[PDB]
Amino acid sequence: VEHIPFSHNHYPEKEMVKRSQEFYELLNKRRSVRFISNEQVPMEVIDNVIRTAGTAPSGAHTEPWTFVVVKDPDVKHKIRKIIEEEEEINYMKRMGHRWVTDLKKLRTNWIKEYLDTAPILILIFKQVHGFAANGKKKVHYYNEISVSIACGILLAALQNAGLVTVTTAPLNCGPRLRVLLGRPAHEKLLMLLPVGYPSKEATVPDLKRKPLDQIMVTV
């Protein structure tokens, strides 16, 4: 592959400052929403936020991500059963006292109503390796990180398109969900995001973010 000049949209410092400020205020309104209405949402928006996630950087340009989108309530209902069953055992046995306590402030449990109500579920699978065209294996360097970075971009894009979600990690649900969705073995489930509009009645926990001087260190 050949290398080409990079061209760059410049801004005056004054407009950089302003774009950076608006975008802070925009993403700072983002909250994880666990109560999602059944109102349908336009698929062109979903298509576009996925395509935005696909602009992410990736280790050695491997693009190791598969975004699986479910609209079908029958499929969504099987997903729900799998996750509620597995999470009930997670909460009652596998997570441990300390994790369960650390979650009290969030009021989460194994009941995940959003898996039926939300019109869209996005299941983000990482590809632990890939395949060349001749069927031999290719290495996916830093695949989990690459996929999580694209997930961060996806979240930004959703916030900026006026949709809500909550990033979830359905512990011990990977295999059953992979099989149910007909995905191949080199894909593993990394996170699941219900997507739509908030419910009229949606709450969030009243959490504060750290001030800049507790996350940023200069030298």
Ligand X SMILES: Cc1cc2nc3c(=O)[nH]c(=O)nc-3n(C[C@H](O)[C@H](O)[C@H](O)COP(=O)(O)O)c2cc1C
Ligand Y SMILES: N[C@@H](Cc1ccc(O)c(F)c1)C(=O)O
Where on the chain is the footprint of ligand X (CB under 6 A)? Answer: 31-32, 34, 57-61, 106, 108, 142, 145-146, 149, 166-169, 204, 207
Which of ligand Y, ligand X, its own copies, none lies near 15, with the C-beta cut-off 5 to 8 A by kind? Answer: its own copies
Judged by CB under 6 A, which stretch of 71-79, 115-123, 167-175, 177-185 contacts ligand Y?
Answer: 167-175
Give the C-alpha separation, 133 to 155, whole Å: 32
194 phi and psi angles, rounded to 5 deg: -70, 135
Give the C-alpha separation, 99 to 159, whole Å: 28
Tokens of 20: 């950076």
Nearest residue (CB) to ligand Y, 14 versus 93: 93
Return the residue of 87, 114, 157, 191 that touches ligand Y, per CB under 6 A: 87
Q: Is 69 among the residues that bind ligand Y (CB under 6 A)? A: no
Q: Is 142 among the residues that bind ligand Y (CB under 6 A)? A: yes
Nearest Cα to 151, choosing from 193, 183, 197, 196? 193
Tokens of 160: 């900026």
Give the C-alpha separation, 119 to 115, whole Å: 9
Tokens of 156: 């930004």
C-beta nearest to ligand Y: residue: 59
Nearest residue (CB) to its own copies, 27 versus 92: 27
- Cα-Cα end-to-end distance for the chain: 39
Q: Residue 60, Cα to own-chain centre: how many angstroms?
A: 22
DSSP string across 132-172: -TTS-EEE-TTHHHHHHHHHHHHHHHHHTTT-BB--B--TT
Residue 123, SS3 per DSSP: strand
Which of ligand Y, its own copies, ligand X, none lies near 160, with the C-beta cut-off 5 to 8 A by kind? Answer: its own copies
Nearest residue (CB) to its own copies, 160 versus 172: 160
Distance in Å, CB of 108 to ligand X, minimum? 5
Return the residue of 60, 69, 92, 179 that touches ligand Y, per CB under 6 A: 60
Which of ligand X, ligand Y, its own copies, none lies near 203, with the C-beta cut-off 5 to 8 A by kind? Answer: its own copies
Q: Is 106 among the residues that bind ligand Y (CB under 6 A)? A: yes
Cross-strand bridge partners of residue 195: 120
Site of interaction with ligand Y (CB under 6 A):
59-60, 87, 103, 106, 108, 141-142, 168-171
